[PDB]
């Protein structure tokens with residue numbers, strides 16, 4: 601559905617980006633820059649808001665469910681790599697909460 | 709009453725179908741950290757959550773909104789991801805359940 605894909609692009613992604621905690625998720629985790637020796641090894645499918653945004657712009661997704669899967673991968677990647685109480689985890693959870701709320705207002 | 713309809717859906721459809729999934733069994737009761745010999749689980753997982761706790765809260769009309777129940781579901785999953793490691797079987801198992809959760813959430817009656 602291009603309608604749901606449009607909502608994910610114009611509402612969900614925009615609103616997550618506006619959130620004050622979005623900045624660490626705004627581009628791929630650059631494991632060389634951040635000195636994370638194991639990240640590319642154990643996180644099999646890195647994902648971020650900018651990749652999702654480019655894919656929606658390029659009409660890469662066929663259904664909204666594939667775009668939603670990328671959002672969930674971005675969040676679970678962060679939980680899987682990090683530890684409870686980490687600040688990055690606290691930011692991801694606030695973003696996931698917002699994501700979960702805006703999905704509840706998805707049309708169709 | 710719109711919250712009630714969505715909570716009925718969460719109870720009778722989403723929770724039921726996750727429970728039916730072959731990978732649901734480790735999530736059907738709270739993680740028993742004593743039984744499982746997990747010395748740090750209760751220390752670092754601040755709000756443990758499981759399918760039986762959610763089932764009981766739905767049966768006891770504990771939630772006021774569907775969003776509060778959805779929060780417990782997400783807590784169940786992120787707890788698992790946060791405590792465990794990428795590639796763990798329990799993580800693969802939660803990811804399958806989480807995918808089903810999002811699929812059934814997509815058919816939630818907009819009320």
Ligand SMILES: Cn1cc(-c2cccc(N3CCCC3=O)c2)c2ccccc2c1=O
Pocket residue numbers: 624625627628629630631633634636677678681682688
């Ligand atoms: C989602 N996420 C994000 C960051 C993270 C923090 C600060 C900065 C950046 N930036 C900025 C541009 C490129 C870049 O990588 C990423 C991170 C750092 C250490 C461990 C885990 C994570 C993580 O899981």
Ligand SMILES: Cn1cc(-c2cccc(N3CCCC3=O)c2)c2ccccc2c1=O
Pocket residue numbers: 734735737738739740741743744746787788791792798
């Ligand atoms: C969600 N989850 C579940 C289990 C897990 C596996 C097998 C059995 C049980 N059971 C059965 C009855 C009580 C009980 O605790 C829990 C687990 C084990 C080790 C580390 C993490 C986890 C985890 O994160």
Ligand SMILES: [Cl-]
Pocket residue numbers: 709710711712
């Ligand atoms: Cl209501």
